[PDB]
């Protein structure tokens, strides 16, 4: 009975990476914060002092 909806992941289609700087910056920024949210925190360090 299983049924899903195709994700539709056609690539770039639009090449903004060659003029729309203004917006890339906004993307990068975004994708970046996104990243930090994931990058696991570290553990077992050497006592600062």
């Amino acid at each position: 009975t299983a049924r899903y909806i195709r994700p539709n992941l056609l690539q770039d289609r639009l090449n903004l990476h060659d003029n729309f700087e203004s917006l890339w910056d906004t993307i990068t920024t975004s994708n970046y914060i996104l990243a930090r949210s994931v990058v696991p925190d570290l553990k077992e360090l050497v006592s600062t002092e």
Partner: peptide
Amino acid sequence: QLLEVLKTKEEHQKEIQYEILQKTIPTF
């Protein structure tokens, strides 16, 4: 004395402009 009354009159100039740019960047 001068090298610190000019890291404040150069963080207005630097500011306003570093921003006049941020208005060209649709970043929340």
